[PDB]
Structure formats: structure tokens, C-alpha cells
């Protein structure tokens, strides 16, 4: 009647299972191409649960079991941002975007490539990893202090609990509610006699500021991550490389990005995705245009409030189209 695993064997087996299950969940949710069928995932998941039941000391923050929800907070702790979560300078016309490029070329002394990306209209978040393990999820708040919503963000399946390398990084992006889930949620709320959400941003914000993680788990949320606070531990030397690297290490990144070799290509991208806007399952409020090379971003620097190497081109609001 002796238990088959010693503590030491269970510890090693738990490590293997968490790594394997995190890999399979990433394939399933983020890559959308699972290498194993659900019953194989479920079988390994149950094995891990049984180990954690027998040996509770083996429950770690990177464990897949820590997603399910159940935890209920009394309130959110403040989450300071040591590196500010800044807002970009804005543009609205062709004139503004070509003027941006003129100012960039004035500073750099040559034409420059731009990394062009969709400005995702959700709740801005920062995800902190230490030794490749998810340790803190935070809202932007005012950009200097937000709310610690780590447990809520664990329920968001696209958020990785571990990375493919044991680096310490602070990763910035957006958490949003897909449009199709937003409209379904409002109908559900209508039927439950609850106030409806004005728009998907409010629904994502409301969802992530619930204290009971079980309720947050019921909501459908997703993420796109696009940069980090400090590139030290990273190998990327350009914004486009940065996006590929974040993707490689486990983050969901937006597939619509494009590296533009001229301002004309930048303008054509803006036009392309203004048209495509309606066809996307997530809301965007514009296009972000960034000087691609980090050496050049470093040369341009920042103003008192914003980068001099990036601009946000704003569309009309989602309600208006």
C-alpha cells in the first residue's frame, strides 16, 4: 500500500508536467495548432493535480493548475511601474505622418525603416517574469501606478505562465475582449438584469477588475504583447526582431505587423488596415509607427512625455464606423 512516488521523484515529475502542459496550452491557445489531442493533455493535467494533492509544497506559480481560478481577493494591491507606461504622440492626417518622417530624417540624417503595427484598443497591461516565471500582472493605471491583477491574468489562457528561457523581463501589451464575446456578454448581462458594458474596452476592464477569479475565468479575454521595459536580457536589435523574439519565448503577438522600408509603404499600410479594420475580431484605434532599429531609437530618445521615434496614427472611433 506504499505511495509510488517519493517527494524527490514527485518534484521532478511535477517540473516535467508543468513544462509539458504549459507547452501544450501555448500550442492550443496561442499557436492554434495543438501537437496532441485533448485527451492526452487532460491525462497529463490530472497526473499533475494528483501530485499537487499528495504534495502541496510542489504547487508553484508557473503551474497550469493555478489558472483555473477560485482565488478571491479582498482588493487589488497597487502595482507601481518602475519604467513608465507612456502614451505616444498622435497623428491624424497624411500630413502628420509625413511630417513625423521629416522630423525623424532631420534627426538621423538618412531614410529609416519603420516597424508598423496595429494599435490594439483594450486594457494596457504589463507582465513581469522572473527566471522565466510569471510573477506579476498589472494594469497600466495612470502609467506610473496600476493595479496588481496577477491572479486574474493567470486565467487568460494566452498569458504564458512560463517562458522558453529563464529571463527576467517586463512585457507590455493589451488585454481585450473579442467583439463576438463582447456582444454575447452584454446579452447575457441584459438577461441577468445587469448593466450592459458601453463597449469592449469597458467589458475587458470590468472583467479584469473583478476580485473573484472564477468570474474573470468565465469571461473571454485575449492578449497581444508588443514590447518590453528593458531589452537587456533580449537578443533583438530591432522592433521587428523584438516581436519575433517575444513570439518565440511564448507571448501572443499581433500577426498584422509589417516592416516598411519607406514612408510611402507606411502610408499604404495605414490605408490597408483602415479598410481591414471592420474585418478584425478585435478593436483597433489606430496604427503605431516605430523607427525599427534600436540604435536609431536610442539616438532619437524621448521628450519629457513620449518617444521621438514613434507616433500613433488615430482612426475615427469604432462606434463611428
Ligand X SMILES: NC(=O)c1cc2c(N)ncc(C(N)=O)c2s1
264 is in an annotated binding site: no
Edge to edge, the sheet with strand 284-291 lists 90-91, 310-314, 284-291, 114-120, 258-260
Footprint of ligand NMN on this chain (CB under 6 A)?
Answer: 24-25, 27-28, 34, 36-38, 41-42, 45, 64, 157
Q: Is 52 among the residues that bind ligand X (CB under 6 A)?
A: no
Phi, psi of 148 (to 5 degrees): -80, 100
> Which one, of 257, 270, 238, 303, lies nearest residue 98 by Cα?
270
193's grid cell: 438584469
Q: Is 288 among the residues that bind ligand X (CB under 6 A)?
A: yes
Annotated catalytic residue, options 71, 78, 110, 119: 119
Q: Is 204 among the residues that bind ligand X (CB under 6 A)?
A: no
Among 101, 147, 174, 283, interactor with ligand X by CB under 6 A:
174
86 is in an annotated binding site: no
247 is in an annotated binding site: no
**What is the Cα–Cα distance from 249 to 137, expressed in whole angstroms?**
17
Phi/psi region, residue 55 (left: phi>0; alpha: psi -120 to 50; beta: rest), is beta
Among 52, 62, 101, 117, interactor with ligand X by CB under 6 A:
117
Among 15, 35, 53, 87, interactor with ligand X by CB under 6 A:
87
Minimum CB distance to ligand NMN smaller for 36 or for 306: 36
Asked if residues 24 and 17 have their Cβ atoms less than 8 Å apart, the reply is no
93's grid cell: 492626417
Q: Is 120 among the residues that bind ligand X (CB under 6 A)?
A: yes
Among 8, 33, 93, 278, interactor with Na ion by CB under 5 A:
278
Minimum CB distance to ligand X smaller for 5 or for 145: 145
**What is the Cα–Cα distance from 196 to 194, expressed in whole angstroms?**
6
CA 48, 53, 57, 62 dihedral sign is: positive
Choose the one of ligand NMN, ligand X, Na ion, none that binds residue 36, judging by a C-beta under 5 to 8 angstroms depending on kind.
ligand NMN
CA separation, residue 56 to residues 17, 59, 69, 95, 213 (Å): 15, 6, 17, 61, 21
154 is in an annotated binding site: no
Minimum CB distance to Na ion smaller for 217 or for 291: 217
Binding range to ligand X, per CB under 6 A, among 59-67, 84-92, 198-206, 270-278: 84-92
Minimum CB distance to ligand X smaller for 44 or for 310: 310
Minimum CB distance to ligand X smaller for 215 or for 259: 259
Strands (E), the chain: 78-80, 90-91, 114-120, 123-130, 133-139, 145-147, 169-176, 222-228, 258-260, 284-291, 310-314
140 is in an annotated binding site: yes
**What is the Cα–Cα distance from 229 to 129, expressed in whole angstroms?**
12
39 is in an annotated binding site: yes
* Least distance in angstroms from the C-beta of 207 to ligand X: 17
Q: For residue 235, indicate whether it is catalytic.
A: no
* Least distance in angstroms from the C-beta of 68 to ligand NMN: 6
Give the other-Cβ count within 10 Å of 142's Cβ.
10
275 is in an annotated binding site: no
Binding range to Na ion, per CB under 5 A, among 119-127, 134-142, 228-236, 267-275: 267-275
Minimum CB distance to ligand NMN smaller for 28 or for 231: 28
Asked if residues 270 and 124 have their Cβ atoms less than 8 Å apart, the reply is no
Choose the one of ligand NMN, ligand X, Na ion, none that binds residue 42, judging by a C-beta under 5 to 8 angstroms depending on kind.
ligand NMN
Give the residue numbers marked as catalytic: 119
Applying CB under 6 A, the residues found at the interface with ligand X are 86-88, 117, 119-120, 174, 226, 288
Applying CB under 5 A, the residues found at the interface with Na ion are 275, 278
Amino acid at each position: 500500500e506504499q505511495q509510488p512516488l517519493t517527494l524527490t521523484a514527485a518534484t521532478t515529475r511535477a517540473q516535467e508536467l508543468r513544462k509539458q502542459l504549459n507547452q501544450y496550452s501555448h500550442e492550443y491557445y496561442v499557436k492554434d495548432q495543438p501537437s496532441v489531442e485533448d485527451y492526452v493533455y487532460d491525462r497529463l493535467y490530472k497526473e499533475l493535480v494528483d501530485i499537487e494533492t499528495e504534495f502541496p509544497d510542489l504547487i508553484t506559480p508557473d503551474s497550469p493548475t493555478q489558472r483555473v481560478g477560485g482565488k478571491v481577493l479582498s482588493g487589488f494591491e497597487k502595482a507601481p511601474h518602475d519604467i513608465p507606461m507612456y502614451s505616444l504622440n498622435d497623428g491624424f492626417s497624411k500630413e502628420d505622418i509625413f511630417a513625423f518622417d521629416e522630423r525623424v530624417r532631420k534627426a538621423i540624417g538618412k531614410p529609416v525603416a519603420y516597424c508598423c503595427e496595429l494599435k490594439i484598443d483594450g486594457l494596457a497591461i504589463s507582465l513581469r517574469y522572473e527566471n522565466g516565471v510569471f510573477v506579476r500582472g498589472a494594469t497600466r493605471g495612470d502609467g506610473t501606478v496600476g493595479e496588481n491583477i496577477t491572479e486574474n491574468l493567470r486565467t487568460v489562457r494566452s498569458v504564458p505562465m512560463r517562458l522558453t528561457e529563464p529571463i527576467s523581463v517586463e512585457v507590455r501589451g493589451e488585454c481585450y475582449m473579442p467583439k463576438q464575446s463582447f456582444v454575447a456578454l452584454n446579452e447575457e448581462r441584459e438577461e441577468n438584469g445587469q448593466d450592459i458594458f458601453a463597449n469592449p474596452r469597458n467589458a475587458a476592464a470590468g472583467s479584469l477588475r473583478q476580485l473573484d477569479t472564477k468570474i474573470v475565468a468565465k469571461r473571454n479575454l485575449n492578449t497581444f504583447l508588443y514590447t518590453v521595459a528593458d531589452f537587456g536580457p533580449m537578443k533583438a536589435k530591432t522592433q521587428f526582431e523584438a516581436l519575433e523574439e517575444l513570439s518565440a519565448i511564448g507571448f501572443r503577438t499581433n500577426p498584422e505587423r509589417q516592416l516598411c522600408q519607406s514612408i510611402d509603404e507606411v502610408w499604404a499600410y495605414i490605408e490597408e488596415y483602415h479598410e481591414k479594420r471592420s474585418t478584425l475580431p478585435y478593436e483597433i484605434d489606430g496604427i503605431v509607427i516605430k523607427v525599427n532599429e534600436f540604435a536609431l531609437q536610442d539616438e532619437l530618445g524621448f521628450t519629457v512625455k513620449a518617444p521621438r521615434w514613434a507616433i500613433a496614427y488615430k482612426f475615427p472611433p469604432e462606434e463611428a464606423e
